[PDB]
Design a binder for this molecule. Structure first.
Ligand SMILES: CCCC1=Nc2nc(NCc3ccc(Cl)cc3)nn2C(=O)C1
Length: 305
């Protein structure tokens, strides 16, 4: 069994599938507790915010999810567990545009936001809660799968070089469509590291950070779009954490914008959600700006037990 903040992803196996029931019964009682905490966060929002028709709609979705989940009887066998997976899959679908509806509701409410820390902490708690819930749910759904090098959602031999390469090719495509070119990426450091890790957090953070590094490079080289400097990624693997540094030669975040980059913009969500995700899983996301030259972004993530 693996662990992250206060959650457990069961790594045990059984011939008779009894491991699926131990995991499903844990999931069955954890999800309503996690969803009730989000309802409490919605009830504690300032009145003027919480009664915004869009924010109110998202609040209602959370009440419907807790209702559908608590109205599901306790899981007695494989047949019960199978139907519980259908409910979980329906909730993941009904809450797909929750972040889109949140930023859209909070944008209208911007005329009443005297303190930006309120919106940051509400979005940090809401976005990390869905990460924890999606990880918990998709791990269980993946315990039925017979994937190679995966115990549920935990990759038994994850290669940080390989996962970075997958998202570099993705970001270079978006970059190439927008600007006609994309900076090449050079990966150095512990390029041969292989270890147990959950890819899902990296699968959100990496494409966002890579998009930012490539956008910055392109925006600071309008003169020569066909010839832009490389983005350098350095991998540092050790017993405590995995460090992935992303360096760009994109001019750097200006002194007057240094605070604004880590806040939610109404959408500029990549950097603040990535930092919330990193902190939620025991890590960090730090920025080092060399104004006039570029930015160095340090992503640290704690290893699995
Ligand atoms: C297949 C998933 C569809 C997706 N389409 C997307 N379009 C963008 N445009 C923002 C952007 C483009 C280029 C640079 Cl350089 C920076 C930012 N992002 N994006 C996704 O993340 C996923």
């Amino acid at each position: 069994v693996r662990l992250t903040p206060t959650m457990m992803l069961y790594a045990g196996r059984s011939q008779d599938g009894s491991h699926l029931l131990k995991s499903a019964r844990y999931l069955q009682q954890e999800l309503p507790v996690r969803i009730a905490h989000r309802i409490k966060g919605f009830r504690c929002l300032p009145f003027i915010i919480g009664c915004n028709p869009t924010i109110l709609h998202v609040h209602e979705l959370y009440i419907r999810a807790f209702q559908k989940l608590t109205d599901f009887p306790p899981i007695k066998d494989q047949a019960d567990e199978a139907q519980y997976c259908q409910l979980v899959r329906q909730l993941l679908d009904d809450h797909k545009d929750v972040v889109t509806l949140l930023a859209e509701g909070l944008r209208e409410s911007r005329k009443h936001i005297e303190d930006e820390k309120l919106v940051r902490y509400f979005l940090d708690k809401t976005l990390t809660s869905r990460l924890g819930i999606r990880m918990l749910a998709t791990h269980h759904l993946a315990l039925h799968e017979d994937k190679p090098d995966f115990v549920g959602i935990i990759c038994t031999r994850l290669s940080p070089k390989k996962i970075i390469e997958k998202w570099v090719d993705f970001a270079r495509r978006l970059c190439e469509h927008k600007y006609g070119n994309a900076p090449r990426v050079r990966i150095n450091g512990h390029v041969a590291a292989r270890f147990p890790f959950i890819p899902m957090p990296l699968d959100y953070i990496l494409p966002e950070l890579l998009k930012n590094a490539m956008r910055a490079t392109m925006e600071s080289h309008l003169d020569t779009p066909y010839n832009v400097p490389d983005v350098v990624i350095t991998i540092a693997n050790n017993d405590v954490d995995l460090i992935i540094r992303i360096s760009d030669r994109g001019g750097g975040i200006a002194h007057k914008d240094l605070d604004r980059v880590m806040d939610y913009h109404f959408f500029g969500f990549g950097l603040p959600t990535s930092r919330a995700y990193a902190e939620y899983l025991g890590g960090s996301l730090q920025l080092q700006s060399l104004q006039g030259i570029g930015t160095d972004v340090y992503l640290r993530l704690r290893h699995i037990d």
